[PDB]
Paper text:
L‐Asparaginases (ASNases) catalyze the hydrolysis of L‐Asn to L‐Asp and ammonia. In contrast, the chain of ASNase from Rhodospirillum rubrum, reported here and referred to as RrA, consists of only 172 amino acid residues. RrA is homologous to the N‐terminal domain of typical bacterial class 1 ASNases and exhibits millimolar affinity for L‐Asn. Crystal structures of the wild‐type RrA, both with and without bound L‐Asp, as well as structures of several RrA mutants, reveal topologically unique tetramers.
Author numbering:
A (entry chain B), C (entry chain B): 4 to 168
B (entry chain A), D (entry chain A): 0 to 171
Amino acid sequence: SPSPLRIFTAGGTIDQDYRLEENGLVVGDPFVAEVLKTARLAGAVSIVALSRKDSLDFTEADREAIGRAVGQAVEDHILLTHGTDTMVETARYLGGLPELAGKTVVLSGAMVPGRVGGSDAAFNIGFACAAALMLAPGVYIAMHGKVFDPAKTRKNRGLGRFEPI
Amino acid sequence: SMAVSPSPLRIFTAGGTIDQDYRLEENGLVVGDPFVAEVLKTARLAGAVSIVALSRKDSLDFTEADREAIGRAVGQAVEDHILLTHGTDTMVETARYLGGLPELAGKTVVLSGAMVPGRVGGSDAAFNIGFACAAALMLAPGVYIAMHGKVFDPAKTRKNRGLGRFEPIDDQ
Amino acid sequence: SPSPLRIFTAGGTIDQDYRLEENGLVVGDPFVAEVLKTARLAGAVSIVALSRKDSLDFTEADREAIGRAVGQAVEDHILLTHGTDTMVETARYLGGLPELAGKTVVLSGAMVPGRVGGSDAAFNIGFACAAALMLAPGVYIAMHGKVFDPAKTRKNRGLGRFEPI
Amino acid sequence: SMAVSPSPLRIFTAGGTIDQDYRLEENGLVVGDPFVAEVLKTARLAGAVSIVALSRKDSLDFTEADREAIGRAVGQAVEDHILLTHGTDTMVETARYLGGLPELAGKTVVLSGAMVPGRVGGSDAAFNIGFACAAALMLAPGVYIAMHGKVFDPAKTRKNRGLGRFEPIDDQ
Ligand SMILES: [Cl-]
Ligand SMILES: [Cl-]
């Protein structure tokens, strides 16, 4: 085989881990690296860290910086792992950038941290890798085993899911 | 009417390494329950996926009659998006057989599985299930093998039994 | 085989699990039950739920109620899973009760939730079950692969461990 | 002087089910690295435990010379608290052999392992390691089998190979 994939990590629930110092969860090392370590991949992949912030902390300036970072990739297939709180805001922002118009850009993450039992993360990473390879140029959210149009999607905080508007 | 989430994907299971589990009686691994069901249980799916168990035979007892039954089951499915979980040692033989059924011509059929049992630590299984579900939804009609985070053409693929990987057969 | 063991669950980090509604960890179902399900035990065990409170929330009245509950057990071998924040306070309280003087009472738990990767919980449960069977009547803390005297122990919050005073 | 945490327990590993792991080459389980090390890595121990790997032989290739080497290693240890991880099919034979060595008379020696490999989901291994570490520290000198959350007298124990459990031999 497939086209080279570049993966950017912006934090989120997917990456949370337990720390004794905080007596709870903190954004830790990118879980996507753990998943891809055992995926026995054939194709070229590179993983780059952007952020470990809470996605609620992202400003417009942070989304502009994420846009420029995705634009630094020569790869035309991109996965961004991200928190679900503001995944829609980032995805809509990227979808408006003429500079990304040739790329397939998929945002994903997890509702349950990858390091907690019963997580969606590994499935979501496989699904989102396929989506980043196979979908036409555009910006997408891949969650819940489907592909969402960011312009027509919202995060339901109370129900812990993405849904059509 | 209130929105109904479609369920475009059906899954069939034929066993293989992906489903192996330890049994005290055998003092070893046997083909267990379908591991794909465990992965989808926690995937928080928007739709549902019907998972239909076809066979758990050991690779050695898996016959041509068994492959026929798989082709009947895939062709009879209403869904046009199909994932078959299967052993890797004869996945190419099953994929090639399904590619020859004209009844499958409008369906996207993806075969997948795992090199390491899902119930053993460090398994490729969950990644492979996520990737193969997407592939079965997104690829054009045809028969494919989805492994190692890529798509293989069954007519141009072999299994390297030593290394536990699929490899392309290069054109000459 | 061994003498019957009664296990009481009072919550704590050991039992924490991720909930979408809280966007974080909450005290969930007792992890000791998950561990003992696969331990293939020969002996008689019964598990009883007392509390799912944060151990910091326990009052003197709650510790008196825990004492009376342990006293309702005919078993002379007792494990109490508990949060580490006030495990010493509960253990010292129980150690002062003449009514428990014939029982072996062991408190344990985990520094990392059992449902998070890399947890101490399963090891701690095996160790603490053995301790509850094998130690002389008394009240003990079993953590870090050793047995602590509650009267001579403190929880180091900053270092996430129990240590001699 | 500032307090030094003693390390009263030494661990020896002789393989067994507890250590089995999946290998692509064998298309199956082999005796892998010592799983006891994985469990103790995350136990947040106050002391340290030296873990000494003695053997990984398949039960079939495990010989009387191999049992002798285990008795030499346990007797030469400075520690008087010893846990040996081992296969369950011949744990009673090894335990009985060690019980006959006068050099072991002041040591508490516990044998343990797992019915299900540590690297397979749903394994007894971590519980068994915690329980057997405590047992090796708390029991009086002697040789014991610690499994199923209890202590077995090797002279009065058999393995039920069908059920994957140790059972007492009742006195008559
Ligand atoms: Cl938290
Ligand atoms: Cl095997």
